A paper describes a structure:
In order to provide a direct correlation of the dynamics observed by NMR with affinity for ceftriaxone separate from acylation, and elucidate whether pH changes and the H514A mutant have a consequence on the PBP2–ceftriaxone interaction, we introduced a catalytically inactive S310A mutant of tPBP2WT (tPBP2WT–S310A, hereafter referred to as tPBP2∗). To understand how pH affects the structure of tPBP2, we determined the crystal structures of tPBP2∗ at pH 7.5 and 9.5 and of tPBP2∗–H514A at pH 7.5. All structures were obtained in the same P21 crystal system, with two molecules present in each asymmetric unit, as previously reported for the WT enzyme. In the structure of tPBP2∗ determined at pH 7.5, the β3–β4 loop exhibits disorder in both molecules of the asymmetric unit but to different degrees. In molecule B, residues 501 to 514, a region spanning the β3–β4 loop, lack electron density, indicating disorder. Although the electron density is relatively weak, more residues could be modeled in molecule A, and it can be seen clearly that the loop adopts the inward and twisted conformation observed previously in PBP2 acylated by ESCs. The only density visible corresponds to the inward and twisted conformation, showing that the β3–β4 loop can occupy this conformation in the absence of ligands in the active site. Importantly, close crystal packing interactions around the loop in molecule A appear to preclude it from occupying the extended conformation, whereas the environment around the loop in molecule B is more open and allows it to occupy different conformations. Consistent with a conformational equilibrium of states, the loop in molecule B is disordered at pH 7.5, but upon binding ceftriaxone, it transitions to the inward and twisted conformation as observed previously in acylated crystal structures of PBP2 (17).
PBP2 is an essential peptidoglycan transpeptidase (TPase) that crosslinks the peptide chains from adjacent peptidoglycan strands during cell-wall synthesis. β-lactam antibiotics, including the extended-spectrum cephalosporin (ESC) ceftriaxone, are analogs of the d-Ala-d-Ala C terminus of the peptidoglycan substrate and as such target PBP2 by binding to and reacting with the active-site serine nucleophile (Ser310 in N. gonorrhoeae PBP2) to form a covalently acylated complex. PBP2 is comprised of an N-terminal membrane anchor, a putative pedestal domain, and a C-terminal catalytic TPase/β-lactam–binding domain. The TPase domain of PBP2 contains a central five-stranded antiparallel β-sheet surrounded by α-helices on both sides. The serine nucleophile, Ser310, located at the N-terminal end of the α2 helix, is spatially adjacent to the β3 strand of the central β-sheet. β3 contains the conserved Lys497Thr498Gly499 (KTG) motif that twists during β-lactam antibiotic binding to form the oxyanion hole for acylation.
Residue numbers in the entry: 236 to 282, 296 to 504, 509 to 574
Write the structure that this text describes.
């Protein structure tokens, strides 16, 4: 009744190592989930030993943004028509800025281009306590109880202690921490139509009892926005998979912060409209051939996702061209 798939596990570990070596990185992790039941199909770590997917806390960076955008849509604090001013700004001395100046974006653009500014403005429409409860409901700070030793709850600071700038940076993934397994888990709220899943190391005959975070319509709209990340104009085109539409988010978190020391993340699901698989890839401190999540973690995501769909017998939803 173990949920692991050895063929997916082998594929994930082989592609993970190829990427870690090619980019001359220190380490990497991969999680592959059943997008419908939360069954864990593969967990891969390199270099060997410690189960970093389970034990290692990371700041998720921009990989948290889909949930902030989803929450803002779900509560009616924005909609798919609003064009937000996304010029850089400061809260006191601390800047909030994107990799480019975008004068304005709608929420599709905020997702597609990965705007820290736009996401922080959406989050700022909620009180600190509301955002704190929301992050907790996503499971940040809540142990997975995977059964592995060395597992931590993650980090979610008490909202009463938050500075306004800290609520802002949390909304684009700094100042809170979770493991790649917890982050991959959060994505089941988007794939499983607004219902967060527990995840399991056992095969699930039916999707288990979960917990609603978003309306079903919100999740479906947000999955559609995330397809823009793998299409031209998005930050994650390296993750597009032949024959499928892929909903994804890229992340490029600085470590501590540092100039040129990063954690590159790529997380996505497919078929985007009716997801079957979530693949999450993190590459720790690439030093060659790029450092952003799309360029670094996209290519292994593409290979692991495409191979996982084929292994599982999922038919392409559009004609193959490659
Ligand atoms: Cl806990
Ligand atoms: Cl689809």
């Amino acid at each position: 009744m173990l949920s692991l798939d050895q063929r997916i596990q082998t594929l994930a570990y082989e592609e993970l190592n190829k990427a870690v070596e090619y980019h001359q990185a220190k380490a990497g992790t991969v999680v592959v989930l059943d997008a419908r039941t939360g069954e864990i199909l593969a967990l891969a770590n390199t270099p060997g030993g410690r189960n970093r997917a389970v034990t290692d806390m990371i700041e998720p960076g921009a990989a948290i943004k889909p949930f902030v955008i989803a929450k803002a849509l779900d509560a009616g604090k924005t909609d798919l028509n609003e064009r937000l001013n996304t010029q850089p700004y400061k809260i006191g001395p601390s800047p909030v800025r994107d990799t480019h100046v975008y004068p304005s974006l709608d929420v599709r653009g905020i997702m597609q281009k990965s705007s820290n500014v736009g996401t922080s403005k959406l989050s700022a429409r909620f009180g600190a306590e509301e955002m704190y409860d929301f992050y907790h409901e996503l499971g940040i700070g809540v142990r997975m109880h995977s059964g592995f030793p060395g597992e931590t709850a993650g980090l979610l600071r008490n909202w009463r202690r938050w500075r306004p700038i800290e609520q802002a940076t949390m909304s684009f993934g700094y100042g809170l921490q979770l493991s790649l397994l917890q982050l991959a888990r959060a994505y089941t709220a988007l794939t499983h139509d607004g219902v967060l899943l527990p995840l399991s190391f056992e095969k699930q005959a039916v999707a288990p009892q979960g917990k609603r975070i978003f309306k079903e319509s919100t999740a479906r709209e947000v999955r559609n926005l995330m397809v823009s990340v793998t299409e031209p104009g998005g930050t994650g085109t390296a993750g597009a998979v032949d024959g499928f539409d892929v909903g994804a988010k890229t992340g490029t978190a600085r470590k501590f912060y540092a100039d040129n020391k990063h954690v590159a993340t790529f997380i996505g699901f497919a078929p985007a409209k009716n997801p079957r698989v979530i693949v999450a890839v993190t590459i720790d401190e690439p030093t060659a051939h790029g450092y952003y999540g799309g360029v670094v973690a996209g290519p292994p995501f593409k290979k692991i996702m495409g191979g996982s769909l084929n292994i599982l017998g999922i038919s392409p939803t559009k004609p193959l061209t490659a």
